[PDB]
Structure formats: structure tokens, C-alpha cells
Design an enzyme around this catalytic site. Structure first.
Site, PDB file in Angstrom:
ATOM      1  N   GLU A   1       0.770  -1.237   0.000  1.00  0.00           N
ATOM      2  CA  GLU A   1       0.000   0.000   0.000  1.00  0.00           C
ATOM      3  C   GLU A   1       0.806   1.296   0.000  1.00  0.00           C
ATOM      4  OE1 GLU A   1      -2.856  -1.114   3.329  1.00  0.00           O
ATOM      5  OE2 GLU A   1      -4.340  -1.170   1.725  1.00  0.00           O
TER       6      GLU A   1
ATOM      7  N   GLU B   1      -5.815  -8.332  -0.107  1.00  0.00           N
ATOM      8  CA  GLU B   1      -6.468  -7.838   1.114  1.00  0.00           C
ATOM      9  C   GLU B   1      -7.937  -7.523   0.824  1.00  0.00           C
ATOM     10  OE1 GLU B   1      -4.711  -4.715   3.759  1.00  0.00           O
ATOM     11  OE2 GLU B   1      -2.836  -5.822   3.529  1.00  0.00           O
TER      12      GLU B   1
END
Length: 468
Positions: free
Chosen positions: A160, A375
Site C-alpha cells: 500500500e 487484502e
């Protein structure tokens, strides 16, 4: 009449070092920025977390019992090199060998990330990745891990990148705690992507035996009233801030014209300078086709509305439904659509958002090669009863997103795996140990793991490949 997934799909589970491990000051582990920051701006600490440092063998047996055949894990940079560089830490390096070996004998394939929100403090408090020097230490750290850990078949550089710039320089929920600094945000997206393009190339150059890619967060951005150009533009710039800029450096080797245009605008309105070296682009350009897979992290979607007013962003960390606020001058503000379900933290549940992102990537960057959902999960306050948790709501969230992948796949998207966040309960970065997400309930007082209803449901799914 139900949906199915490919027979060879990866039904995995996810973890992060700092969230799960614990032992923050054990076996020579060096400090990370969260150490002081949590103690000073929050109500909880990373100790004991879910004690993965000692519990990994228990978590893995369970993961195996319930069908988990993949696991995302991350190596703590500050455990190998306690000061970012210099001397290796013998005990740290040893721990990971033991972990990977356990994954292997348990048949749970390890997907290893080098950096997951935990730059060793020394370099963090020195400008993190905005400091080009720290770029060098990363590549060095990476190169060492590529060499030292040959048991690993899948590698991811950063987890991320968008959310780090956002959390550290825009919203300020992540250390240092800077707000509304849009220059830092982009310079960081840029600097970290260079670090990645260099890391992946080296892994490809030294010719190891495995795969390397990136794990990007990509929440779908939609205009509030699609028939209003001002709203359309609003989504466009918001998306550029969180997705386009990075996706471009990832698959184009450079930033596209619209990206650059939207960027300049944003920077004109809010002020700022972007330091881009020619060399930065050669590194980016070389690695564009070197990524083997793309890990998409996805939880929610956002609706943008045009707005001319001063920027203000408020983070709902305590989970008080409705307390969020996000408006950016020159960009737009987020307006949650009326009757769409959303969690206590204001995360809109919109499954079709995932499908849209996939087809978007697929249509904009055909060289994506392979997609893995790295995720996806639902964070809520589970109610522990009967040595379980009847997380039918979690099962519902998950079931809907898997059903949306099944379609993406059927429509030509190369999705080869899905990783629920998280395998077991781990504390949340800016939300405390309240926001549970795990397939396994962890009583933090006894570190005992109790399988929740979704675990059982995951087992069934894993071994039947039927989303029922």
C-alpha cells in the site's frame, strides 16, 4: 446455479509483522516510528499484539486445518537491520527461516512483503522515503533478503504505497502526522515507486527462482452525480491522487498526460514542488514489464462531489458512525451515497467496486499479467460467544466480493487468488484492538485462538470452490 472459482485458486489469509508479531524490543529488534507515536497519540500499543513471534506454529496448523493454502507475511526491516543498514541481526534472520520452513511443511505458501508500514525509525525520522538516501538503503535491504531467503517463491516490495502517503502526509493518522501536504504525498508515491522499480529489476537481474510484484490499494472512485461534469472531474482528481499516478509509474514507466495535468492542478491550488529526476524515469521504465503479478487491496469505494472551500479531513478512528469528513480544495469532497451499507468506521460496502477496478486495470494496463486479491475483509466488533463468533455479516461481505471476482474472471480478468484480511485478529493501525477482522478470534489476554463461523465457511469454500 451458484458461482464457482478456479480449481487452482489461492484461498489465503493475511498478516503484517508489526500488527501480529509483537516482541517489539526482543531479540535485537530495532525501533520503528509506531513505537513512540502509538504511545503518544493513541490508546493502545503494539505489545503484545497477537504474539505471532511465538504463535506462528499454532496459527499455521489452524490455517492448514481450515483450508488456507496461502499466507501473506511481511519481514520486519528493523529486525534484520535494526538501524536500517549496517550490521545484520542474526536472531532476526533466523526467525524468518523458521517461519518460512513452518509454512512450507504446513503447505501454506508464503507471500512475503519487504515493507509494510514499518520503516526502521532511524531512517523514518530522517524523511522516510522523501529522503533519496533511504531509497538506497531499501534496495540494499531488499537485495539481502533476496539472497538470504531462497525458500521464498513469491515476493512483494511494498504494501500500500497510496495509503502511506495518505496516512503520513495528507490525513496525518500515520507518523509523522503531517496533514494536507499534497506535495509530500506525490513525492512519496514517486520515490517509493522508484525504490520498487529498482528492487524488482535487481531480483530479475540476479535471476532468482520465484515471482515479484506490488501490493496496491485501489478503492474505486465514483462521481456523486455522473451527469455533473464537476463531479466527474472530482472523481478524476481523487483517483489520480490515490490510484492513477502510481498505476502509471507501475505500468507505463512514467506519468501519463492526464495524470500530469490533474497533478499540476491540484498542486497549483494547494501549492507544492515535485522533484523528478530523469534517472528516476529510466528506473521506472525498465521495470514496467518486470512485475509478475499485481496484488490489489480493496475494502471500499468513494463518491466525490465538487467543492470550493478550505480543505479539512477528519478520521473516524473510534468507529463513531458518521464522524468522517474529507474535503480538499480544488479536488472535491466525499459524500456517502444515502442508502448504501457502511461500517461504524464509515467504510462503504460496495462489492461491484472491486469488479470495476479489475476491469479498469485490465483495460488500462494490459501488461498487468496476473491479479491476486491480497487484502479484503470486514472490520467490526465481533461478539465472542460460545467460543466462537457468529460473523454472518463477515461471511456476507466476503461472499459478495468472491462472487464479484468469479464474474471478473469469467469476463477475462486473470485473478488467481484471494487473501482475506486477516488470518487471525491483530490490532488495527489507527483503530486499536477493537476493529477485528480475523477468521480466527484471538483472546488478547490469553493469546488463545478460537475459530469463528467464517473459518468453517472458508474451509468449505476452499475445498469445494463453490461460493454458497
Amino acid at each position: 446455479m451458484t458461482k464457482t472459482l478456479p480449481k487452482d485458486f489461492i484461498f489465503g489469509g493475511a498478516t503484517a509483522a508489526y500488527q501480529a508479531e509483537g516482541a517489539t524490543h526482543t531479540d535485537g529488534k530495532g525501533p520503528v516510528a509506531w513505537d513512540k507515536y502509538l504511545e503518544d497519540n493513541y490508546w493502545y500499543t503494539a505489545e503484545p499484539a497477537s504474539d505471532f513471534y511465538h504463535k506462528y506454529p499454532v496459527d499455521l496448523e489452524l490455517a492448514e486445518e481450515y483450508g488456507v493454502n496461502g499466507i501473506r507475511i511481511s519481514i520486519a526491516w528493523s529486525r534484520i537491520f535494526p538501524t536500517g543498514y549496517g550490521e545484520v541481526n542474526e536472531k532476526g534472520v533466523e526467525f524468518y527461516h523458521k517461519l518460512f520452513a513452518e509454512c512450507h511443511k504446513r503447505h501454506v505458501e508464503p507471500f512475503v512483503t519487504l515493507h509494510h508500514f514499518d520503516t526502521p525509525e532511524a531512517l523514518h525520522s530522517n524523511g522516510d522515503f522523501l529522503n533519496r538516501e533511504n531509497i538506497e538503503h531499501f534496495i540494499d535491504y531488499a537485495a539481502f533478503c533476496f539472497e538470504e531467503f531462497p525458500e521464498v517463491n513469491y515476493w512483494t516490495t511494498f504494501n500500500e504505497i497510496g495509503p502511506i502517503g495518505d496516512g503520513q502526509y495528507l490525513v496525518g493518522k500515520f507518523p509523522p502526522g503531517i496533514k494536507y501536504d499534497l506535495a509530500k504525498v506525490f513525492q512519496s508515491h514517486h520515490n517509493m515507486m522508484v525504490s520498487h522499480a529498482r528492487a524488482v529489476k535487481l531480483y530479475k537481474d540476479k535471476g532468482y527462482k520465484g515471482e515479484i510484484g506490488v501490493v496496491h490499494a485501489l478503492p474505486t472512485k465514483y462521481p456523486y452525480d455522473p451527469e455533473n461534469p464537476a463531479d466527474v472531474r472530482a472523481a478524476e482528481l481523487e483517483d489520480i491522487i490515490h490510484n492513477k499516478f502510481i498505476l502509471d509509474a507501475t505500468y507505463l514507466g512514467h506519468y501519463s498526460d492526464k495524470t500530469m495535468e490533474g497533478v499540476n492542478h491540484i498542486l497549483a491550488e494547494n501549492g507544492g514542488e515535485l522533484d523528478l529526476r530523469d534517472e528516476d524515469f529510466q528506473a521506472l521504465d525498465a521495470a514496467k514489464d518486470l512485475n509478475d503479478f499485481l496484488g490489489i487491496n480493496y475494502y471500499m469505494s468513494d463518491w466525490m462531489q465538487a467543492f470550493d472551500g478550505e480543505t479539512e479531513i477528519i478520521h473516524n478512528g473510534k468507529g463513531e458512525k458518521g464522524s468522517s469528513k474529507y474535503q480538499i480544495k480544488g479536488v472535491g469532497r466525499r459524500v456517502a451515497p444515502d442508502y448504501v451499507p457502511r461500517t461504524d468506521w464509515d467504510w462503504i460496502i460496495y462489492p461491484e467496486g472491486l469488479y470495476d477496478q479489475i476491469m479498469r486495470v485490465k483495460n488500462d494496463y494490459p501488461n498487468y499479467k496476473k491479479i491476486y486479491i491480497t487484502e479484503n475483509g470486514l472490520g467490526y466488533k465481533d461478539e465472542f460467544v460460545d467460543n466462537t463468533v457468529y460473523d454472518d455479516g463477515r461471511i456476507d461481505y466476503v461472499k459478495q466480493h468472491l462472487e464479484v471476482l468469479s464474474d471478473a474472471i469469467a469476463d477475462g480478468a486473470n485473478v488467481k487468488g484471494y487473501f482475506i484480511w486477516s488470518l487471525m485478529d491483530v490490532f488495527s493501525w489507527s483503530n486499536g484492538y477493537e476493529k477485528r477482522y480475523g477468521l480466527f478470534y484471538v483472546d488478547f489476554d490469553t493469546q488463545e485462538r478460537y475459530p469463528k463461523k467464517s473459518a468453517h465457511w472458508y474451509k468449505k469454500l476452499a475445498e469445494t470452490q463453490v461460493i454458497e
